């Protein structure tokens, strides 16, 4: 199973957001696992995607991997 | 390619005049980054219309795919860049291209609530019955995300 941000965003239908993570050196779901709505806003993720990405991160926390 | 790396950065940053100068000086229009994005992917995702135009005029591949099956059209359709969608379609973008999760441009316009893009995609032959890997149509996704204007246009299409 792929822990890349690129796979995570693909699954969420948010691949258009990838370059906002890449420019900050963010490549794995474990780097962003503790990100708030505010952290995502600070990446300049378009507002329309923030809730979906945040719920994806929450879903990852909810696995208790 | 050094000019190719420069072109990807200029396309990312939305610096049209810089893109034009790099293309005039022989930059590879189809340069790729580590994820398989071209300057056209970057300009479509970040909403740089004049750069999309310049890149297409200087021989950009309108159907270039990254390492997860994304073409530029679904990236523009997702963020709601209607002008970019129409320019890509006019340059021969595959309206029903599917990514690794089987999502089409219609799926992603329906997902992120872009009504006028859905309408433009329908006019260009978007497939209302196309199923993604979860078995869902654009209509099903428009329900899931509450995009009510899109539910009304796709209902029993």
Author numbering:
A (entry chain A): 545 to 609
B (entry chain B): 2 to 158
Source paper text:
ITC measurements with the isolated p63 SAM domain showed a KD of 16 nM and the formation of a stable complex was confirmed by a shift in elution volume on size exclusion chromatography. Currently, the exact function of the SAM domain is not known, therefore we cannot speculate if the interaction with the DARPin results in an inhibition of the SAM domain’s function. Pulldown assays with in-vitro translated full-length p63 isoforms demonstrated binding to both dimeric (TAp63α, TA*p63α, GTAp63α) and open tetrameric isoforms (ΔNp63α) but showed no binding to TAp63γ, an isoform that lacks the SAM domain. These results were confirmed by fluorescence anisotropy measurements with fluorescently labeled DARPin, showing interaction with the SAM domain both in closed and dimeric (TAp63α) as well as open and tetrameric (ΔNp63α) isoforms. Fluorescence microscopy detected strong DARPin-created signals in cells expressing TAp63α, TA*p63α, GTAp63α, and ΔNp63α but not in TAp63γ and TAp73α expressing cells, demonstrating the high specificity for p63 SAM domain-containing proteins of DARPin A5.
Here we describe the characterization of Designed Ankyrin Repeat Proteins (DARPins) that were selected as tight binders against all folded domains of p63. For the initial development of DARPins as tools to study the p53 protein family we have focused on p63.
